[PDB]
């Protein structure tokens, strides 16, 4: 009745698990098991949410577990216990297999290939928590059990890629739990979490398993960003060598996004800009990825205003995000006019929203940038312009004061002018004729190398699957 549903779901898990199990027995493989595993990842979520909650319990009991069943059952008793389908034929069989973990073979103990099955059990329970959307203690129980289970053996290459996804969910529930509410107990537990992250990474270094390391790098960077220890993060990003190999296109997207935040705080607005446009192009378009994309687009707009580049007006209208980016739309206009008065009003008015996204910190820095941007307009519109006239437009107080502002802004060399003190005006030196200079040479040189590197990336990718078709039988 209820058992029928559990049994349909159970069989689903087993075929994906059985397939992989054969693959890793021939020699540990990475990307071929990963493809299967990634599809199973989605499946477990859609069945668990929509269909029962002791549906996880049935599979876990049926296989030979090391303690995992005990760990699952505690959670369910609390929310109203289910003990049904722990009866023979659901606690006696270990699920039909040919010999790989077959019921007879396993009970007799000629084999105990519990290994992959144990990893999959961890994934089911962790997913089921996130699907339920419950935090506090349920999270703490998940963290305590699974972390030392995996570290009392040196994982083989194949098992290791599974446990990176386990490290993710533990961390995410913990982080949001701290962001639920300030608690004196939440606070002390974050030091506990911090320690484990870096230790996981060191294991991932030893086996040079590329996707394990990359995923772990993301979590460390996220936690730094939330605690405001960017100082501690500057060092960390300097000692990266990020793999671009076995990764998922989701891993690569997150990575470039994290550099941009750190970069912005280190007043790297130049490399930050490429990195955020890069992150979006790996990242899928979907409503499933929307909260990721939002934060990326907010980050991008602000980066441009800090350059003085000024985002397009177009960016805000054509996106289906106009409400979320609504403050950024008004910031773009504020800097455009050079308006202190508008700008001060915009960032106060929207303060809290900005404060949630942790971009409130970036916005206050734009107060300088209204002044610098104001002066770049003024040097374009007028070749020679009195000191007083400038004061009218930007609501300034003295001639001497605006002279300091321009003096500093052209030390950054944005305005491309030079100040006449003795005559009372500011005279631009812009006249181009830079096609008589050697400048175009440099620019052309860079484009060519980018083109050549695109060839190299065509080479590594194209011929690699060709080889495989000669290897496999299809004649």
């Amino acid at each position: 009745l209820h058992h029928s549903e559990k049994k349909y779901a159970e069989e689903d898990q087993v075929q994906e698990l059985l397939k992989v199990l054969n693959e890793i027995s021939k020699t540990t493989l990475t990307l071929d098991p990963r493809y299967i595993w990634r599809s199973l990842k989605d499946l477990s979520s859609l069945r668990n949410q929509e269909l029962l909650n002791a549906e996880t319990l049935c599979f876990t009991v049926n296989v030979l577990y090391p303690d995992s069943s005990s760990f699952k059952k505690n959670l369910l008793k609390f929310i109203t216990s289910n003990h049904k389908s722990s009866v023979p034929g659901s606690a006696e069989l270990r699920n039909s297999y040919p010999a790989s973990f077959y019921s007879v073979n396993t009970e007799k103990k000629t084999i105990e290939v519990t290994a992959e099955i144990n990893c999959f059990m961890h994934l089911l329970v962790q997913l089921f928590l996130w699907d339920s959307k419950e935090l506090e203690q349920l999270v703490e129980f998940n963290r305590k059990v699974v972390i030392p289970n995996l570290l009392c053996y040196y994982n083989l290459r194949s098992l290791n890629l599974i446990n990176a996804k386990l490290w993710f969910y533990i961390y995410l529930s913990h982080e949001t739990l701290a962001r639920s509410s300030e608690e004196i107990n939440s606070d002390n537990q974050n030091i506990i979490l911090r320690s484990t992250m870096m230790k996981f990474l060191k294991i991932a270094s030893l086996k040079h398993d590329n996707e394990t390391k990359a995923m772990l790098i993301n979590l460390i960077l996220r936690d730094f960003l939330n605690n405001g220890e960017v100082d501690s993060a500057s060092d960390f990003i300097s000692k990266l060598e990020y793999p671009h190999t076995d990764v998922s296109s989701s891993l690569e997207a997150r990575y470039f996004f994290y550099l941009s935040k750190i970069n912005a705080i280190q007043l790297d607005y130049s490399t930050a800009n490429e990195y955020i446009i890069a992150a979006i192009r790996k990242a899928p378009h979907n409503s499933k990825s929307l909260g990721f994309l939002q934060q990326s687009n907010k980050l991008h707009c602000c980066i441009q205003l800090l350059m003085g580049d000024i985002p397009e007006l177009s960016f805000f209208h054509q996106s289906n995000m106009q409400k979320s980016l609504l403050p950024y739309y008004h910031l773009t206009k504020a800097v455009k006019l050079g308006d202190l008065k508008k700008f001060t009003s915009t960032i106060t008015k929207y303060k809290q929203l900005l404060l949630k996204d942790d971009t409130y910190q970036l916005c206050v820095r734009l107060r300088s940038n209204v002044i610098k941007t104001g002066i770049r307009i003024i040097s374009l519109t007028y070749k020679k312009i009195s000191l007083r006239d400038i004061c009218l437009k930007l609501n300034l107080d003295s001639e001497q004061t605006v002279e300091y502002m321009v003096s500093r802004a052209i030390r950054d060399g944005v305005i491309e002018a030079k100040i006449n003190h003795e005559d009372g005006f500011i005279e631009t030196t812009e006249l181009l004729n830079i096609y008589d200079s050697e400048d175009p040479q440099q620019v052309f040189d860079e484009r060519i190398k980018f083109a050549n590197q695109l060839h190299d990336e065509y080479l590594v990718s194209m011929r690699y699957p060709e080889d495989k078709k000669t290897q496999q039988n299809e004649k």
Binding site: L380, T381, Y382, N433, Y435
Partner: protein
């Protein structure tokens, strides 16, 4: 059919209340005469939907605002009753005739044609939903490809009639598909005129120019707003798109524009401006700019979206051409040429210069205007790299996407 386009145009004056007082008054009386006679009562109700607390409202069959400067759109409860009477009676009689034809044999010709006649009655009175369905029956039945084009066009007219651009957009795509299959030139001329006005309502007037020059040479008047307005549309797009020389040869390659002479206020105001740009009159130019705003842009359905857009762009052009021809000017003289004061003149210029579609700078101490636009090898270089950057980007994402899969 033909009556629709006149009614809408006059109706747009009631939609606005930034237009002239005597003009809006006149337009209300015309619309009311044809509400009685031609059944334009469903579309009169459509006007209040387009408000709900907005000016131009006064309706008493719906929401009122006599605070509005329009108070000549007011409904009557005689009107509400006249609506309901004619609506029901006409649908019932006209339909019964059609039912008989369906009973009788021959559906290839007789029945499809009979269904066209329903969709023309609903087209007339401003029912879009009811027109679409019944002309949906004509298309279902196999007929001439030319007729199918004629019918889609009757439907496309109705989107401008309500002034909903999305409805046109959709429908003119089906016309483009069937225009080649018929291969008729009769309605090829119409299609360009329709599609011209869709391009006019959106910001691409370059396309609009290319379709509407064909419409001068040959005009197809049924179901399409009258030929003096079509001149006014060609002239609008002409000023925006072209520059002196091109503009001059366009309106001498159209004899008809000159021989039609100004015979309506909108045509007069646009044509005065056309001459002065290409003859390089600046003196009387600056007043004509104001006249076009008043008598073309706001009264027109499609250029009322372009009232602020046009005036902003048109000033760039007139300045652009003068500055390109000069290394330097004096500001006071440049102000006099147009007919403004010195200080006033900067303000307009000073929005155009940082967008950098005017490529100049202004000394305020010498009082000279410097022109430092490259027009050499340096300009071609500056343009090219933007495209070549674009090519880099296209390859960066597509490259990644195929390699990962």
């Amino acid at each position: 059919r033909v009556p629709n386009y006149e009614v809408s145009e006059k109706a747009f004056l009631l939609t606005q209340s930034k237009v002239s007082i005597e003009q809006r008054k006149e337009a209300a009386e015309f619309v009311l005469a044809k509400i009685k006679e031609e059944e334009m009562a469903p579309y009169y109700k459509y006007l209040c939907e387009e408000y709900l607390v907005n000016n131009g409202q006064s309706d008493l069959e719906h929401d009122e605002k006599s605070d509005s400067l329009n108070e000549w759109i007011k409904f009557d409860q005689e009107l509400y009753n006249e609506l309901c009477k004619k609506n029901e009676s006409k649908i019932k009689e006209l339909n019964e005739k059609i039912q008989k034809l369906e009973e009788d044999d021959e559906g290839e010709l007789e029945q499809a044609q009979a269904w066209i006649n329903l969709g023309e009655y609903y087209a007339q009175i401003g029912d879009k939903d009811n027109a679409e369905k019944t002309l949906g029956k004509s298309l279902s039945k196999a007929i001439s490809t030319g007729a199918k084009i004629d019918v889609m066009l009757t439907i496309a007219r109705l989107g401008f009639f309500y002034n909903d651009q999305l409805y046109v957009k959709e429908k003119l795509e089906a016309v483009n598909s069937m225009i080649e299959k018929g291969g008729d030139w009769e309605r090829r001329n119409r299609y360009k005129t329709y599609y011209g006005i869709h391009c006019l309502a959106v910001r691409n007037f370059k396309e609009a120019a290319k379709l509407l020059v064909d419409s001068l040479a040959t005009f197809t008047s049924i179901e399409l707003t009258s030929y003096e307005s079509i001149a006014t549309y060609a002239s609008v797009t002409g000023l925006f798109t072209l520059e002196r020389t091109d503009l001059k040869s366009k309106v001498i390659d159209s004899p008809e524009l000159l021989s039609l002479i100004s015979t309506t206020a909108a045509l007069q105001s646009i044509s005065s401006l056309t001459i002065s740009l290409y003859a390089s009159d600046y003196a009387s130019y600056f007043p004509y700019l104001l006249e076009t705003y008043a008598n073309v842009l706001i009264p027109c359905k499609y250029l009322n979206r372009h009232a602020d857009f046009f005036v902003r762009e048109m000033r760039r052009k007139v300045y652009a051409q003068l500055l390109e021809s000069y290394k330097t000017l004096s500001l006071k003289s440049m102000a006099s040429a147009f007919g403004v004061s010195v200080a006033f003149l900067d303000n307009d210029l000073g929005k155009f210069i940082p967008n950098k579609q005017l490529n100049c700078v202004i000394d305020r101490v010498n009082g000279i205007v410097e022109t430092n636009r490259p027009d050499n090898k340096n300009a071609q270089y500056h343009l090219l790299v933007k495209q070549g950057d674009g090519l880099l980007t296209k390859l960066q994402k597509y490259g990644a996407a195929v390699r990962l899969t």
